[PDB]
């Protein structure tokens, strides 16, 4: 039952509870070892726990496909320190250390609970004979495909020695299939299922976006005759929402240019919001300055370029506010998504404007024909100008700010409770985009 | 979970026309294909029609230029407008919502294939 993963995840890995319900479930569905399961969670311990736990209880051994040996060597490593019998199969053994591994496998019950292998050995002829040996004496209790997005061409990370995995899973039939990845879109998630052969029905644990606690609103430039003081007006309402502790916490503003980073900082200080420019051009001990200021809340405003490091997060970031939409909805979640980690209450705004939207519409066209001369046509250039298109759709249509962001990413529809600006009045929004239309000449 | 609701279904002469319907219900995120398959009396099930998400179309030969196969993706729903019905079309009719993707807000789903119960379509000479 429970009790059995409960004991070995603290007598083993030492947790008293796991870290959200979502990881549970997961974990549970992997022990009950009747169906193919896909994980999508953000990188950290829960995404690994949800088959290495598993892979103990099991009483056979687990092979973990991961794409290079970077990735298994940190993991062998914190494995090797909980005291697990874990081991690495590559090129870059020695022919000794293989021949007694490969023989240490051939044994009746080896001491390899957990073998880690990269995508080219687990499809490689010389290795198919220990693999069927495995299955034959029923010692293969589960295959694990880690960086599973790596099968796919839309995605960020393609790997071409990933599409030999798909051959495998049926030659493992009796071993479920376990499928990971921090970083899945719909189509990302389709290519998986398919390119993996994964055998329905597939268990899917999806870790969503969505966070109560943010307040999402587009405002159109196009309407706004004076832009710099509804940004301190958003900026000064944003802060002090502690009237005794009068200004508490600390805001970002993104924007495309360095130009435009330096005049707005300005535009704000002259209003009496203290704001510094943060970007590329400025030196390294500036930069350390206004980081530094910035953390430390001398200064409680950032203007930044997407250049802006994340070496620690701020719990206390109460707006993100882009001047100008970003590249994608990946980098707009991530970036509005620095705001209200404390839990409190926060406001993430989007400045759009059809001028920004056809700048950076054309300059994403330009960046990719320009990597299509350096390394070819792909297909993941056409994922780069739909993450752009999830955007323009998000600021130029009616609904629900949280359902575009789940939508994109493949969650459920989330609980918004007047958590946007559509949700909170529909008609405002609704005004707002008429309005917008009749500005279209 | 997943139902699939077929109708549409019943007797005509030969010459005429039905449209089969499948609407799918559920916490359906997506459909990859919507597909009709028919089987007759003591014969193997074939696929008559399928439509992607896309709108990628795939008919059997026997159908072509009679049949049409159409989908509201919002609605998970799929229709097969069937003219010029011949007698060798008499079968069960059966939907698939193959590659249906469910989640809830919690962030568990699944991934799997759904078939409706069948709809029986005759054809009199």
């Known amino acids: 039952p429970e009790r059995r993963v409960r004991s070995t995840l603290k007598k083993v890995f030492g947790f008293d509870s796991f870290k959200t319900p979502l990881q549970e479930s997961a974990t549970m569905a992997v022990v009950k070892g009747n169906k193919d399961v896909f994980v999508c969670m953000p990188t950290g311990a829960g995404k690994s726990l949800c088959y290495q736990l598993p892979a103990l209880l099991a009483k056979g051994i687990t092979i973990v496909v991961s794409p290079l040996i970077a990735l298994i060597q940190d993991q062998v490593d914190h494995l090797l320190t909980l005291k697990v019998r874990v081991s690495s199969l590559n090129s870059k053994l020695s022919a000794q250390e293989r021949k007694e591994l490969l023989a240490d496998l051939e044994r009746e019950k080896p001491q390899t609970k957990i073998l880690y292998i990269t995508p080219e050995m687990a499809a490689s002829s010389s290795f198919q004979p220990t693999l069927n040996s495995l299955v034959s004496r029923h010692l293969l209790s589960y295959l694990v495909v880690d960086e599973a997005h790596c099968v796919s061409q839309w995605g960020h990370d393609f790997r071409p020695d990933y599409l030999r995995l798909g051959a495998l899973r049926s030659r493992l039939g009796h071993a479920p299939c376990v499928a990971l990845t921090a970083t899945a879109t719909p189509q990302v998630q389709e290519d998986v299922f398919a390119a993996l052969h994964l055998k329905k029905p597939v268990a899917i644990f999806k870790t969503p976006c969505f966070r109560a606690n943010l307040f999402y609103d587009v405002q159109f430039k196009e309407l706004i005759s004076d832009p710099y003081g509804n940004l301190k007006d958003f900026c000064l309402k944003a802060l002090g929402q502690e009237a005794d502790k009068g200004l508490s916490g600390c805001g970002i503003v993104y924007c495309r240019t360095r130009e435009a980073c330096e005049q707005l900082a300005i535009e704000l200080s002259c209003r009496g919001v203290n704001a510094k420019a943060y970007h590329a051009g400025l030196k390294a001990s500036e930069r350390t300055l206004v980081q530094n200021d910035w953390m430390e809340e001398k200064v409680p405003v950032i203007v930044a370029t997407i250049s802006f490091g994340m070496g620690v997060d701020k719990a206390n970031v109460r707006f993100v506010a882009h001047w100008n939409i970003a590249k994608s909805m990946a980098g707009y979640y991530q970036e509005s998504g620095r705001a209200g980690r404390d839990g409190k209450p926060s406001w993430c705004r989007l400045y759009y404007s059809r001028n920004d939207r056809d700048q950076v519409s054309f300059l994403i066209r330009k960046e990719v024909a320009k990597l299509q001369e350096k390394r070819g046509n792909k297909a993941s250039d056409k994922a780069t100008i739909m993450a752009f298109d999830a955007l323009v759709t998000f600021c130029e249509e009616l609904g629900c700010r949280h359902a575009a962001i789940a939508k994109y990413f493949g969650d459920a529809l989330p609980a918004c409770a007047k958590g946007c600006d559509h949700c909170q009045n529909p008609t405002a929004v609704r005004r707002r985009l008429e309005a917008l239309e009749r500005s279209s000449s | 979970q997943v139902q699939l609701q077929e109708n549409g279904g019943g007797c005509v002469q030969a010459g005429g026309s039905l449209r089969l319907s499948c609407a799918a219900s559920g916490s359906i995120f997506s459909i990859n294909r919507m597909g009709w398959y028919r089987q007759a009396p003591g014969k193997q099930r074939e696929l008559v029609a399928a439509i992607t998400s896309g709108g990628s179309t795939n008919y059997a030969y026997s159908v072509k230029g009679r049949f049409t196969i159409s989908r509201d993706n919002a609605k998970n729903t799929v229709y097969l407008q069937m003219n010029s019905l011949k007698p060798e079309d008499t079968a069960i009719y059966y939907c698939?919502?193959?590659?249906?993707?469910?989640?809830?807000?919690?962030?568990?789903?699944?991934?799997?294939?759904?078939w409706g119960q069948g709809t029986q379509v005759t054809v009199s000479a």
């Open positions: 698939e919502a193959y590659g249906t993707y469910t989640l809830a807000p919690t962030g568990e789903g699944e991934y799997d294939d759904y």
